[PDB]
Design a protein around this ligand. Structure first.
Ligand code: FIP
Ligand code: FIP
Ligand code: PLP
Ligand code: PLP
Ligand code: NA
Ligand code: NA
Lengths: 393, 262, 393, 262
């Protein structure tokens, strides 16, 4: 039994082998006591500010909404240390681990961003970190690999399956199911078994809390909508959580549409997939008619988790949040537009959110709307990807 | 039916532990799998534990991950699995057959419908590897409405609260996990005692059991028998290009494990 | 004649063709009025905070001084937008230009960092930017090139000479000497003719002013020394300027020693070069006995300007600041050490400062000293360079 | 000496503008440069403007940047330049010779020592391209202590304050900049008037002068003559592999520019 409700409506749960329940309940209990622990709080806050650089700027776009009645702010998680919002929660989870007495951390990554973030938090905090990565991404994500080992982290090559996020995720769980007594599994997004969706959200929620204070100081009023990309759901639930009871603020989650919903090659399980049970939870996921789990496709490798956090599936079902999709091409156009008009290179993940915001502005240009886009990361890491696509045209 | 009650009545009247082989259905192809299963039974298997090919076997080591991939290479689907299963029950009327499933396959088309199809094909039990007792209500209810025994894992780290739930909810046999980690041929008195004290379905030990002394030992500890998978899957694996040898190697491992149950 | 003294002691001056004097005096006069202009101030401050992300964190190193009596803080200019401290002054200069009515900006770059910074500031502010770059660096600094053109900037290939900073710098001056009526030349460091050394310092001085307020809040006292790398001198004079009258604070400038002073292949003109007249000023520079100007060598391409700001030559001569050198190997060791123990990848420029600070700590481990290292930039851009060197060993 | 006073006395008594070619000393080699200079003089040059190879010719366009590189390819140094210069003065006793320098070369071994060496070799003037009038005190003082005329540039954007300084400090000739930018064959009445009103050394126009009508025009505007560099350097450039032709092409450009001065 649990201290917190593991379900958001029908979604969520703890669908893991019985052997892992105790680790999960132990993780839940430590989080609840760390949450009412003022030392814990003060310590997480200090690292976020003096080490990660919070609070991040809330920057008003000047040139891109020219000629419309849209005012657009970007919450600058691209300026966080590590270049993405993932640093916030690996710091929190790494403290939690220490608070549990764990000394080792297991993480898995595809593109390698969560891998880099787990390795910096572990380097800082004295934790030994092992990261599963696909045998092929090691070949192409050399830059990220090299960073992780520069950080002291052990990178473990996987050859089981396709080396897709799915198999990295399984490889990591299998290992945890043998070493949970000393290792803490640092899940990368707000999905997976309880209490992970709740813990990653609480550890990302300062995004929305800063944006609310910052928009209120600069505009004197809450936004009309906050928009965020959704690959597993953590930057988005981080941005949304504080506005959930401000019912006039729209919450918009943007999944990758890939090549286009019609083709089948996308990564939008929330709106186009089917409830399944996998990743330790019950949520919408990409799967065959036969129940085999499938891949998510996106030009950004960072939006490919083929399922989505359970609190997003539940906010969508009661109609508190709306979820849309943005194709590769639309995300690339937004990526070029932000570089040229504001001098900010955005991660291609974040470009999906920004393209949705641009479409809102462009479709109805005389609609007066105060929008906040969660710029979840910076796009230096995507420069070759965008270059090569652009070379090809 | 009551295939497990009856098989354990029979085994107890002859003071023998159960020997239960696990294989992935359809590995390495449907006909060969059908022949591997007949050979297992012919060799003395008292019951069968059968895996349905799933895309993400998260509680399974590499030997069995590889048996899942071979099955998919052969094009095996859940549907083909059920036809195979009805062919097995038609050939062997009294052997208890249990499925090892992952949750998404049971839930996919309706939990109750998955258990209705087990009942029609003659399956006797189902173990869903990623459904802990805490989430099992819908699963165990649907199994009991279709006369299917819902099997639960009793892990090495079980507390007393779990022991009692396992005993009250499980039927057929109690799956006794030999260690942490995952299936794999490469890697409990009190649990056993408490299970009998709480009137749990007879336990079967598994995970890591690979040799005949192990079988003898489990029975001696009080387990009613042992399951073994990776060590049978390895034999299939080794002899992939020589089928005849595959059955002869299988035949011999089985009778040796079976003879150790006595 | 001028409003401000163009000399720091004997160094400095305005050694440019007579045709450029009016542009320089015009630039001096606009800076002086922008400096007493409260609108100007408020506008520069706003962009620095809501757009570049200031103030940057002052982070206390936890793991690297373990076992010594050194307490080390890093001023985090690596977290500024653009990943280096150069963003501060291109923002200021780009406003200045607008304040002068200029609409075009000329910049030159080698590695490409100043190029990227001029292009983002120009993209943001509506300026048309042209950047000279060597024909070869275009071939190897494709990543930076691509960023600049992504930003709307025109990149102009140079084949005159070796395409060394020296020729980029000349190419840019030649162009300014024909288009100064509409273009503003955005000099990249605190060197060159007056009033450039004074303007880049004033536009970088918030580095030291924040560090002073931040160290005073966290330690209750001024540091024993602030340390900074010196390629042309702007991050260092930015860090030093506010402590110049706090005579108990040592000011240490670190030039690149390259392969080693003894070899001749270094970039330490301040302590090992000879006063010359070039780059529009009188300062120490690398030059032959015959007076031909030479190259600076360093493993970091960002420390290769072969001369150094005139206020640094003057602080050294009266003994207010001390200048030392750090070789490539020492800078690489500091680079690996910061990644592993603090999870921060430092630019290889900044690694020279950090290696000097480590040497101070390591040489006299029981000396009690509060040191501040100016982490001028982040080292994602050097990852291949460090990898390849490391591959080779 | 007074070579410029005397040459301008002579030219004024025959109502002729001065025609002054600029070349880089040592381009493309020392002997060829010595022959190019004798040909220039033979062809009618009234005076010489000579460039000393410097590493960073920041007020020079590409034609002359290339003449600096050829000179270095030949291994020409400042020292070799001074020997060449003494060989020129020994052959041609009365032609005024001026140097075009960049500051670092004058400062390098002592400003006063550089001008002492000019005086010993027979140079008559020196123009330091990157020393504006505002920084020129040390330079002009050392030139006047060694009887060298310090030449200043009167740029198109000059104000009255500058005009007066140029007139008071300059001696020999006033260098009149034809436009902004840099030297280069590819790209002023009132200035002229004010210069004579303030008693400036006779002006010589330069930058961009490439054809004979241009020469005639400068003299007509009141300039006392014209300097031309890139257009002479281009000829050297074109005929690099055919020296004989180089002199014959040079000979003809010069006499045409010279004849236009009359
Ligand atoms: O002999 P070994 O070690 O391969 O165990 C296999 C036991 C039967 C088995 C096969 N796959 C599984 C997945 C989960 C689970 F709980 C049990 C099994
Ligand atoms: O003919 P052109 O355009 O090459 O000008 C050359 C004039 C003589 C000349 C050659 N190099 C110079 C550098 C600076 C300067 F003030 C004048 C000159
Ligand atoms: C990882 C990442 C994402 C996607 O993860 P979520 O958990 O879905 O937020 C989005 N943006 C960036 C920049 C990321 O690194
Ligand atoms: C450009 C740069 C330098 C060197 O320039 P200075 O003007 O000498 O400060 C140092 N560090 C980084 C990170 C730089 O980009
Ligand atoms: Na997803
Ligand atoms: Na330098």
């Amino acid at each position: 039994t649990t201290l917190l409700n593991p379900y958001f409506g029908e979604f969520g749960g703890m669908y893991v082998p019985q052997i892992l329940m105790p680790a999960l309940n132990q993780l839940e209990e430590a989080f609840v006591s760390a949450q009412k622990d003022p030392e814990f709080q003060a310590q997480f806050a200090d690292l976020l500010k003096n080490y990660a650089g919070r609070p991040t700027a809330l920057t008003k776009c000047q040139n891109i909404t020219a000629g419309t009645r849209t005012t657009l702010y970007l919450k600058r998680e691209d300026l966080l240390h590590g270049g993405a919002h993932k640093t916030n929660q690996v710091l929190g989870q790494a403290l939690l681990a220490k608070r549990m007495g764990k000394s080792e951390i297991i993480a898995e990554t595809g593109a390698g961003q969560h891998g880099v973030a787990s390795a910096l938090a572990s380097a800082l905090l004295g934790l030994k970190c092992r990261i599963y990565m696909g045998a092929k991404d090691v070949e192409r994500q050399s830059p990220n690999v090299f960073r992780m080992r520069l950080m002291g982290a052990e990178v473990i090559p996987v050859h089981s399956g396709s080396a897709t996020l799915k198999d990295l995720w399984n490889e990591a769980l299998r290992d945890w199911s043998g070493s949970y007594e000393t290792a803490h599994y640092m899940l990368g997004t707000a999905a997976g078994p309880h209490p992970y969706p709740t813990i990653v959200r609480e550890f990302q929620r300062m995004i929305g809390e800063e944006t609310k204070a910052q928009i209120l100081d600069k505009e004197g009023r809450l936004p009309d909508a906050v928009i965020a990309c959704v690959g597993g759901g953590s930057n988005a639930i981080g941005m949304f959580a504080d506005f959930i009871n401000d019912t006039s603020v729209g919450l918009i989650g943007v999944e990758p549409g890939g090549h286009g919903i019609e083709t089948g090659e996308h990564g939008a399980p929330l709106k186009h997939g089917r409830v399944g049970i996998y990743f330790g939870m019950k949520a919408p996921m990409m799967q065959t008619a036969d129940g085999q789990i499938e891949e998510s496709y996106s030009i950004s490798a960072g939006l490919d988790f083929p399922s989505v956090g359970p609190q997003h599936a539940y906010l969508n079902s009661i109609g508190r949040a709306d979820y849309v999709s943005i194709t590769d091409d639309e995300a690339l156009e937004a990526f070029k537009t932000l570089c040229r008009h504001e001098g900010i290179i955005p991660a291609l993940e974040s470009s999906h959110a920004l393209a949705h915001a641009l479409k809102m502005m462009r479709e109805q240009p005389e609609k007066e709307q105060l929008l906040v886009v969660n710029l979840s990361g910076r796009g230096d890491k995507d420069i070759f990807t965008v270059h090569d696509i652009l070379k090809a045209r | 039916m009551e295939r497990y009650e009856n098989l354990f009545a029979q085994l107890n009247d002859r003071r023998e532990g159960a020997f239960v082989p696990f294989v992935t259905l359809g590995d390495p192809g449907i006909e060969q799998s059908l022949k591997i299963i007949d050979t297992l039974i012919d060799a003395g298997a008292d019951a069968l534990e059968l895996g349905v090919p799933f895309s993400d076997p998260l509680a399974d080591g590499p030997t069995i991950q590889n048996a899942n991939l071979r099955a998919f290479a052969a094009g095996v689907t859940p549907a083909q699995c059920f036809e195979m299963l009805a062919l097995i029950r038609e050939k062997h009327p009294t052997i208890p057959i249990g499925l090892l499933m992952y949750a998404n396959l049971v839930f996919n088309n309706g939990i109750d419908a998955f258990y209705a199809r087990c009942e029609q094909v003659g399956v006797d039990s189902v173990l869903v590897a990623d459904v802990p007792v805490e989430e099992s209500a819908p699963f165990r209810q649907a199994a009991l409405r279709h006369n299917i025994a819902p099997i639960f894992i009793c892990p090495p780290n079980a507390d007393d609260d779990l022991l009692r739930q396992v005993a009250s909810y499980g039927r057929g046999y109690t799956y006794l996990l030999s260690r942490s980690g995952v299936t794999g041929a490469e890697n409990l008195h009190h649990l056993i005692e408490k299970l009998k004290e709480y009137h749990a379905a007879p336990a079967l030990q598994g995970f890591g059991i690979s040799s005949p002394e192990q079988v003898s030992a489990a029975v001696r500890a009080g387990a009613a028998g042992a399951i073994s998978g990776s060590a049978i899957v390895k034999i299939i694996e080794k002899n992939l290009a020589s089928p005849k040898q595959m059955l002869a190697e299988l035949r011999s491992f089985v009778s040796a494990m079976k003879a150790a149950s006595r």
